[PDB]
């Protein structure tokens, strides 16, 4: 982002301008829709707008009942999914979140017992917003929505009297497809994904009920201001569970993430093979420490794979369920004289292949066996030819790099790039410490 520093000593790059936010825990939220006594009244006079929608609502209720009854069947002491519908349904939630689906499900078992939902309904009798405590000390924020029940009951049964249906209106029929949209989409999502939706949508929680349910958590005044502006990524990392249909209401829960850390410097380290130690003797080194890094409490957290973290410009949305704690002396491998303080793992072996590693600001390229690799752009097709490798090139100097008729694009972001002068590694590198470069 802000500054990239090139290191000839080990052929690596570091970008040091990323403020970060790390997830810490989950905040739950229990809803309760209303559909009312739609199952009782019947429409049996001509096919028209009202007739074709009542059957839709009743069929949706039937499908929701079937999928809720089938939801308490998959929980056969299952913890490791071994089915196509479940393995492919658990990877879209995030591998690091697979340990969070279990926590949500275990919370679901507590709240679907008797005398638990009874408390929730009692807590919502007079108001649509009432925080309630569970039996095991956990606090649950309960939200109630009553759009249909205040439409099916008070100003629908009058119109449909004596089963002389569909005749005495042409406008209320249009409104019956207005209040009915949310419930149909909710049941469709839950029946399509077996009750475990992959992310919140504007059907589970509208934009009004997300800003109100994020300013009711107990948090600082900065973690709230950050969420009320990153509510897109908040929606992207929270999943909703299904509790069931208890009579004529739909109860489900939705898990909102909590950002425990809001500002702390972070950096990316990216590497590629080192050198032609001796022309024909291609025995050169390779850092295997790439990934992310962030500070939380004076102990840097390390994510070995870059897919575990995202980016929204400066802010970095990592998580603390897959982080690996490293000593805060790990930043000393960037000034490499083969220091014995922190043993850098790096690697060992003699099979160097030409590689390209895309950097946030520039790009780094290595060509060893004499492959025709050339710097390219848009205004000029071929600008210059480079020799050997580890020649880091900016994204202002070049716009594409070509290696074995395979082009790579470069980013347009701008930052104060830096280069650290240093001699590359020599023929013999013994004092480098001991990694495990296998598997």
């Amino acid at each position, epitope marked *: 982002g802000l500054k990239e520093s090139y290191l000839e000593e080990s052929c690596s790059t570091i970008t040091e301008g990323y*403020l970060s936010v790390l997830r*810490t825990g989950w905040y739950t939220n229990v809803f309760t829709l209303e559909v009312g006594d739609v199952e009782n009244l019947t429409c049996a006079d001509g096919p028209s707008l009202i007739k074709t929608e009542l059957d839709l609502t009743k069929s949706a209720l039937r499908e929701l009942r079937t999928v809720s009854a089938d939801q308490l069947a998959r929980e056969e002491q299952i913890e490791n999914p071994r089915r196509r519908r479940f393995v492919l349904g658990a990877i879209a939630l995030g591998v690091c979140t697979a340990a969070a689906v279990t926590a949500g499900v275990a919370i679901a078992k507590t709240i679907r017992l008797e005398s638990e939902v009874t408390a929730i309904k009692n807590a919502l009798k007079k108001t649509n917003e009432a925080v309630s405590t569970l039996g095991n000390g956990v606090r649950v924020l309960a939200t109630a929505v009553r759009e249909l029940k205040d439409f099916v009951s008070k100003n629908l049964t009058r119109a449909i009297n004596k089963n002389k249906c569909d005749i005495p209106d042409l406008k209320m029929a249009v409104s019956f497809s207005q209040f009915n949209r949310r419930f149909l989409n909710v049941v469709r999502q839950f029946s399509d994904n077996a009750g475990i939706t992959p992310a919140i949508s504007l059907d589970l929680m509208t934009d009004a009920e997300l800003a109100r349910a994020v300013s009711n958590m*107990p948090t600082s005044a*900065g973690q709230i*201001k950050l969420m009320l502006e990153n509510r897109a990524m908040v929606r992207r990392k929270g999943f909703g569970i299904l509790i069931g249909v208890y009579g004529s209401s739909v109860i489900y829960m939705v898990q909102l993430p909590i950002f*425990g850390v809001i500002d702390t410097p972070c950096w990316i380290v990216k590497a590629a093979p080192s050198c032609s130690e001796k022309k024909g003797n291609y025995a050169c080194l390779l850092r295997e420490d790439q990934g992310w890094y962030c500070q*939380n*409490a004076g102990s840097t957290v390390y994510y070995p794979n870059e897919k575990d973290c995202e980016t929204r410009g400066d802010h970095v949305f990592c998580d603390t369920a897959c982080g690996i704690n490293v000593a805060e002396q790990s930043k000393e491998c960037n000034i490499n004289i083969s220091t014995t303080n922190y043993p850098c793992k790096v690697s060992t072996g003699r099979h160097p292949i030409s590689m390209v590693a895309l950097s946030p600001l520039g790009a780094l390229v290595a060509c060893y066996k004499g492959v025709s690799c050339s710097i390219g752009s848009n205004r000029v097709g071929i600008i210059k030819q480079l020799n050997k490798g580890c020649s880091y090139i900016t994204n202002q100097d070049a716009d594409t790099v070509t290696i074995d008729n395979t082009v790579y694009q470069l980013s347009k972001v701008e930052g104060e790039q830096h280069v650290i002068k240093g001699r590359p590694v020599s023929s013999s590198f013994d004092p480098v410490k001991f990694p495990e470069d296998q598997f």
Partner: antibody
Amino acid sequence: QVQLVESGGGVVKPGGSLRVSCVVSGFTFSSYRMHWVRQAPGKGLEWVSSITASSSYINYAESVKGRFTISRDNAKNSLYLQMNSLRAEDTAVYYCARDENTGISHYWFDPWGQGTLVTVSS
Amino acid sequence: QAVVTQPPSVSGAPGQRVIISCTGSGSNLGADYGVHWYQQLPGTAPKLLIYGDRNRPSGVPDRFSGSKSGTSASLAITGLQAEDEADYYCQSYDRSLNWVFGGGTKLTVLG
């Protein structure tokens, strides 16, 4: 080993200015939010300011809003508290306290500094 | 919103039990936010006594215990000595006032 030293206290006329500092030592300064807590002579403690770990979100108390300004220097290990238009009801003792939190609902100032005194009289 | 209220002074006798209360309101302790206790000696800076409403940082001599429930918190000092004469403040978090401090009570031993 954590040790917070503040300096800059003195006597200043009403409607003046004064810049209090605080130097940290023994821990990573660029990872902790830091506060400024003041205590009138013989009264209870009161919170004054706060700045996150990278000078992004800054919160001021209600009575000092529009007159103070907190800053940081993550490389020189200090945080500063500019004052302006001081009044006679401002004299107090200022502490710089590191910030501790558990993540969700617990917030406390654990390693308080030493403290400096600011006298403001005509 | 509202401020945290504490009794002015508390008197005790050696070897007895002392209870210090910290009464909150509906916006700071009613929203599940902590109560934190600081002991200020007559000449020094405050030091942490209890964090998280029940825990103890290393150094506190195991005779200080706390409890929070609803909109109140309490501190219990078992076997009061002659060296525990100080001021005790209770700290929370309020929704609209970012950090609220209590008035502060002073424990006086009658030996």
